[PDB]
Design an enzyme around this catalytic site. Structure first.
Site, PDB file in Angstrom:
ATOM      1  N   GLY A 112     -64.748 -92.559 -30.366  1.00  0.00           N
ATOM      2  CA  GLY A 112     -63.548 -92.096 -31.087  1.00  0.00           C
ATOM      3  C   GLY A 112     -62.766 -91.097 -30.257  1.00  0.00           C
ATOM      4  O   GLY A 112     -63.320 -90.599 -29.287  1.00  0.00           O
ATOM      5  N   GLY A 113     -61.529 -90.809 -30.648  1.00  0.00           N
ATOM      6  CA  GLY A 113     -60.576 -89.993 -29.868  1.00  0.00           C
ATOM      7  C   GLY A 113     -59.155 -90.327 -30.261  1.00  0.00           C
ATOM      8  O   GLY A 113     -58.941 -91.440 -30.782  1.00  0.00           O
ATOM      9  N   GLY A 114     -58.217 -89.419 -29.996  1.00  0.00           N
ATOM     10  CA  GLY A 114     -56.948 -89.286 -30.741  1.00  0.00           C
ATOM     11  C   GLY A 114     -56.159 -90.587 -30.818  1.00  0.00           C
ATOM     12  O   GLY A 114     -55.094 -90.587 -31.482  1.00  0.00           O
ATOM     13  N   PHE A 115     -56.633 -91.647 -30.147  1.00  0.00           N
ATOM     14  CA  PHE A 115     -55.859 -92.885 -29.853  1.00  0.00           C
ATOM     15  C   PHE A 115     -56.517 -94.121 -30.504  1.00  0.00           C
ATOM     16  O   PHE A 115     -55.960 -95.222 -30.399  1.00  0.00           O
ATOM     17  CB  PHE A 115     -55.694 -93.033 -28.334  1.00  0.00           C
ATOM     18  CG  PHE A 115     -54.831 -91.970 -27.691  1.00  0.00           C
ATOM     19  CD1 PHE A 115     -53.890 -91.266 -28.440  1.00  0.00           C
ATOM     20  CD2 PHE A 115     -54.948 -91.678 -26.335  1.00  0.00           C
ATOM     21  CE1 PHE A 115     -53.097 -90.293 -27.854  1.00  0.00           C
ATOM     22  CE2 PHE A 115     -54.137 -90.715 -25.747  1.00  0.00           C
ATOM     23  CZ  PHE A 115     -53.223 -90.019 -26.511  1.00  0.00           C
ATOM     24  N   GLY A 116     -57.605 -93.939 -31.245  1.00  0.00           N
ATOM     25  CA  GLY A 116     -58.284 -95.051 -31.935  1.00  0.00           C
ATOM     26  C   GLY A 116     -59.782 -94.867 -31.928  1.00  0.00           C
ATOM     27  O   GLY A 116     -60.250 -93.806 -31.482  1.00  0.00           O
TER      28      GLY A 116
ATOM     29  N   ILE B 198     -63.894 -96.836 -31.701  1.00  0.00           N
ATOM     30  CA  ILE B 198     -64.721 -97.982 -31.300  1.00  0.00           C
ATOM     31  C   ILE B 198     -65.985 -98.039 -32.165  1.00  0.00           C
ATOM     32  O   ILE B 198     -66.634 -96.974 -32.393  1.00  0.00           O
ATOM     33  CB  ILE B 198     -65.033 -97.944 -29.802  1.00  0.00           C
ATOM     34  CG1 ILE B 198     -66.035 -99.042 -29.440  1.00  0.00           C
ATOM     35  CG2 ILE B 198     -65.487 -96.585 -29.358  1.00  0.00           C
ATOM     36  CD1 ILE B 198     -66.052 -99.328 -27.967  1.00  0.00           C
TER      37      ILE B 198
ATOM     38  N   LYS C 269     -62.860-102.282 -31.130  1.00  0.00           N
ATOM     39  CA  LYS C 269     -61.877-101.183 -31.008  1.00  0.00           C
ATOM     40  C   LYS C 269     -60.775-101.417 -32.028  1.00  0.00           C
ATOM     41  O   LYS C 269     -60.228-102.559 -32.104  1.00  0.00           O
ATOM     42  CB  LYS C 269     -61.297-101.093 -29.593  1.00  0.00           C
ATOM     43  CG  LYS C 269     -62.312-100.654 -28.546  1.00  0.00           C
ATOM     44  CD  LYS C 269     -61.897-100.980 -27.095  1.00  0.00           C
ATOM     45  CE  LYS C 269     -62.774-100.314 -26.045  1.00  0.00           C
ATOM     46  NZ  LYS C 269     -62.139-100.310 -24.690  1.00  0.00           N
TER      47      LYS C 269
ATOM     48  N   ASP D 201     -57.462 -93.252 -15.638  1.00  0.00           N
ATOM     49  CA  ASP D 201     -58.437 -92.427 -16.392  1.00  0.00           C
ATOM     50  C   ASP D 201     -59.852 -92.716 -15.898  1.00  0.00           C
ATOM     51  O   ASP D 201     -60.776 -92.906 -16.728  1.00  0.00           O
ATOM     52  CB  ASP D 201     -58.253 -92.652 -17.895  1.00  0.00           C
ATOM     53  CG  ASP D 201     -58.944 -91.628 -18.785  1.00  0.00           C
ATOM     54  OD1 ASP D 201     -59.269 -90.509 -18.289  1.00  0.00           O
ATOM     55  OD2 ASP D 201     -59.260 -92.013 -19.924  1.00  0.00           O
TER      56      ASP D 201
HETATM   57  C1  LIG Z   1     -70.313 -92.217 -26.307  1.00  0.00           C
HETATM   58  O1  LIG Z   1     -69.215 -92.542 -25.453  1.00  0.00           O
HETATM   59  C2  LIG Z   1     -68.865 -93.862 -25.329  1.00  0.00           C
HETATM   60  C3  LIG Z   1     -68.315 -94.286 -24.130  1.00  0.00           C
HETATM   61  C4  LIG Z   1     -67.868 -95.587 -24.000  1.00  0.00           C
HETATM   62  C5  LIG Z   1     -67.958 -96.474 -25.074  1.00  0.00           C
HETATM   63  N1  LIG Z   1     -67.459 -97.791 -24.968  1.00  0.00           N
HETATM   64  C6  LIG Z   1     -68.148 -98.974 -24.998  1.00  0.00           C
HETATM   65  N2  LIG Z   1     -69.487 -98.940 -25.131  1.00  0.00           N
HETATM   66  C7  LIG Z   1     -70.128-100.124 -25.123  1.00  0.00           C
HETATM   67  N3  LIG Z   1     -69.618-101.355 -24.988  1.00  0.00           N
HETATM   68  C8  LIG Z   1     -68.278-101.357 -24.856  1.00  0.00           C
HETATM   69  N4  LIG Z   1     -67.502-102.447 -24.609  1.00  0.00           N
HETATM   70  C9  LIG Z   1     -66.202-102.016 -24.433  1.00  0.00           C
HETATM   71  C10 LIG Z   1     -66.130-100.669 -24.587  1.00  0.00           C
HETATM   72  C11 LIG Z   1     -67.451-100.220 -24.869  1.00  0.00           C
HETATM   73  C12 LIG Z   1     -68.530 -96.043 -26.265  1.00  0.00           C
HETATM   74  C13 LIG Z   1     -68.992 -94.745 -26.390  1.00  0.00           C
END
Ligand SMILES: COc1ccc(Nc2ncnc3[nH]ccc23)cc1
Length: 292
Positions: free
Chosen positions: A22-26, A28, A43, A134
């Site tokens: 999570g974060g200001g832009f959406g 996951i 996402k 980024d």
């Molecule tokens: C705790 O910090 C995080 C950093 C990165 C993500 N992202 C993803 N994690 C796994 N599989 C993924 N497929 C696409 C993105 C994604 C989640 C949490």
């Protein structure tokens, strides 16, 4: 305040298990694919939220399908409440893996082999006309399958920007571009609010690999953006290389010579990593620090 509740089902197919970021832009989510029965990354962004990023993320993710080091695209959709993209779920991010290390350092074996994969993923996104902007450890993760557990994936494209037109010509740079990325890994050019180029992604890679092998950067404990920028602009970057392979002087020298318009020499930088493994008998099939 979460967009989707746990057990919420998207398009009668993707069942929310939990928020994983999570974060200001959406946001996951980890979801279950009710058809294929694997878990996936989901996402989501509010239909209303004023900055619409997923349109960016999806366009870049589709352009990159068939590359190594990117998530398989599964689906996307809109509706009244949110937009969404479904992609392949990956394992532990490199920020967590680094933090988990006894000294907060990777061995040079782990460091150099991650460098090769991340460099490939940076050349890949540049090759389809986008800057990442980024590049940071939390934007990469290792696979979670027998077929992928030693592969490193670029996870997110939410700050990316097209640097070409349709024809492959470099767009004109803005006179001023407010830098938006993470302070720790930003180039001097980004700190100065200049239009970022392909070289600025490679600066971020350079800072990340130093922090990997050495365990910290000199500006670690500063969160103020302007302060970090002033430290970086002064700092003798050869000092960063004191305790790195000397072939890294070539990496530094090359990226310090680039401007916004100039295509980087990625094979020069790939050589730095490979030669560094060579002179040290680091094998392409060695265990990563976090296995054994
Ligand atoms: C705790 O910090 C995080 C950093 C990165 C993500 N992202 C993803 N994690 C796994 N599989 C993924 N497929 C696409 C993105 C994604 C989640 C949490």
């Amino acid at each position: 305040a979460d967009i989707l509740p746990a057990n919420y089902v998207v398009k009668d197919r993707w069942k929310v298990l939990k928020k994983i970021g999570g974060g200001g832009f959406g946001e996951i989510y980890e979801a279950m694919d009710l058809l294929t029965r694997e878990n996936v990354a989901l996402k989501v962004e509010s239909a209303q939220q004023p900055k619409q990023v997923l349109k960016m993320e999806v366009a870049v993710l589709k352009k990159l399908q068939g590359k190594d080091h990117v998530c398989r695209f599964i689906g996307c959709g809109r509706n009244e409440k949110f937009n969404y993209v479904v992609m392949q779920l990956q394992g532990r991010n490199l920020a967590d893996l680094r933090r988990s290390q006894p000294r907060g350092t990777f061995t040079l074996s782990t460091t150099l082999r991650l460098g090769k994969q991340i460099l490939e993923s940076i050349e890949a996104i540049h090759s389809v006309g986008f800057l990442h902007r980024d590049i940071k450890p939390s934007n990469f993760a290792m696979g979670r399958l027998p077929s992928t557990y030693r592969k490193c994936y670029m996870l997110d494209f939410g700050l990316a920007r097209q640097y070409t037109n349709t024809t492959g010509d470099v767009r004109p740079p803005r006179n001023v571009a407010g830098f938006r990325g993470t302070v720790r890994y930003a180039s001097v050019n980004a700190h100065k609010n200049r239009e970022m180029g392909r070289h600025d992604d490679l600066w971020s890679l350079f800072y990340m690999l130093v922090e990997f092998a050495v365990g910290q950067l000199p500006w670690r404990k500063i969160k103020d953006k302007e302060q970090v920028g002033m430290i970086k602009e002064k700092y003798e970057h050869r000092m960063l290389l004191k305790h790195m392979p000397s072939e890294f002087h070539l990496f530094l020298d090359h990226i310090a010579s680039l401007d916004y318009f100039t295509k980087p020499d990625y094979q020069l930088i790939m050589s730095v990593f490979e030669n560094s493994m060579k002179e040290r008998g680091i094998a392409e099939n060695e265990a990563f620090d976090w296995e054994k």
